[PDB]
Amino acid sequence: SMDHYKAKATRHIFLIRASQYHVDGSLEKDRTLTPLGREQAELTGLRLASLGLKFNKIVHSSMTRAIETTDIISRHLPGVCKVSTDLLREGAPIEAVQYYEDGARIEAAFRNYIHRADARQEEDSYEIFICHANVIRYIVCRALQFPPEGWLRLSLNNGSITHLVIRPNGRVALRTLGDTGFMPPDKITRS
Amino acid sequence: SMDHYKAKATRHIFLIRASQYHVDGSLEKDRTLTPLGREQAELTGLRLASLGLKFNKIVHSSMTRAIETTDIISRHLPGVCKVSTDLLREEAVQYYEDGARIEAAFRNYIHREEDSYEIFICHANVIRYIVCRALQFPPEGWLRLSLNNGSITHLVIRPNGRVALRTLGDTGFMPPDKITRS
Ligand code: NA
Ligand code: NA
Ligand code: NA
Ligand code: NA
Ligand code: NA
Ligand code: NA
């Protein structure tokens, strides 16, 4: 749960891990989704669209694989706006200064997108964030007040859905973590 | 990682919450699955059978709704043996002892030569406790987990006691209109 938090209605947070991609791509432009990663993103988009929810926005990491995952998912959610942010780019694997910078940035993402209540909120909101494993691990453990040793104990599949429910007073519930039950087992990967 | 733990191979633990049931049943024999609860259990059994795994055993709570959830899931898993236990069943002295029983379940089934795949069909408070205990999360954390009826929660315990949570509360294989929390 979160301290010093007061929102006007309940917020549903859907954290999506980017789909399978070309890890060995030389440049960032080369680190595109694999054919299977594209199929994974289609399955996640189908599932999100079947929920019968009006999503307020899709916020996504600016990494190539997150942009491409977002593009595919967004096809299933016509009219939902998309916002790119460098704050949700992946953090270094769990050089000291790079880790300092990543920790500060992902904390800023948590504060800006998760802990921040929108004074303009007028009804329950449903928000999609398409990003990366370490970012999602950090956000989940911070929101639930789990220790940082918890990050590596969460093992998230490509394209998986993690669903947090934030009540107006800051109580946070974990409804699902790493959900890929909507994918056939022969399409499920971790990298 | 879990302390004082040394296994010979990796253990996959699938924790299944019982399906929707008649909460207002007067006696325990009356607290049976609803028609939708039976459909949920069928969906979970279909999913478990599709994973390409040979399950070593199904351990289940002796509560009526867990027995009936197990009966349906087991139809999809021929040859997998079933074990009933009171340890997994869901004033002040009775509540303390119920809590002590859940810690005993954790010690007996979780903390205790080839990789194994084990199914445990039980209840929300038991599963949430086990998840937070295995992941070494604070004791207050359990109530922050919200599990759907018939959901699959998947823990992996490595031989050195390292634990990973692969999924929690998965009902992605159910159509949205079949999903319930009570
Ligand atoms: Na990329
Ligand atoms: Na809220
Ligand atoms: Na996962
Ligand atoms: Na029952
Ligand atoms: Na759930
Ligand atoms: Na359900």
Author numbering:
A (entry chain A): 88 to 181, 193 to 289
B (entry chain B): 88 to 177, 193 to 214, 220 to 289
List sentences quoted exactly from the publication behind this structure.
Chaikuad et al. suggested that capping of the active site by the β3–α3 loop positions active-site residues in the catalytically competent state. However, a crystal structure of Δ90 PGAM5 H105A without the MM that we determined suggests otherwise. Although the crystal packing is identical in the two Δ90 PGAM5 structures, the active-site residues of Δ90 PGAM5 H105A adopt catalytically competent conformations (PO4 “on”) in the presence of a phosphate ion. The main difference between this dimer conformation and the apo “on” state of the dodecameric ∆90 PGAM5 H105A/MM structure is a disordered β3–α3 loop in Δ90 PGAM5 H105A. Thus, in the absence of discrete phosphatase domain interactions with the β3–α3 loop, the active architecture can be achieved, at least structurally, as long as a phosphate ion is coordinated. Altogether, these structures point to a remarkable plasticity of the PGAM5 catalytic center, which indicates that multiple structural elements coordinate for catalysis.
Phosphoglycerate mutase family member 5 (PGAM5) is an atypical protein phosphatase implicated in a number of functions within mitochondria, including organelle homeostasis, mitophagy, and cell death. However, unlike most PGAM enzymes, which are phosphotransferases or phosphohydrolases of small metabolites, PGAM5 dephosphorylates protein substrates, targeting phosphorylated serine, threonine, and histidine residues. Between the MTS and phosphatase domain, PGAM5 contains a linker domain with a centrally located “multimerization motif” that potentiates PGAM5 activity.
